[PDB]
Amino acid sequence: YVLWKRKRMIFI
Numbered sequence: 927y928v929l930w931k932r933k934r935m936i937f938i
Contacts (some may be wrong), residue, residue: 928935
């Protein structure tokens with residue numbers, strides 16, 4: 927997975 931998938935980039 928990415929690194930900011932938590933919420934910082936909810937959309938993506």
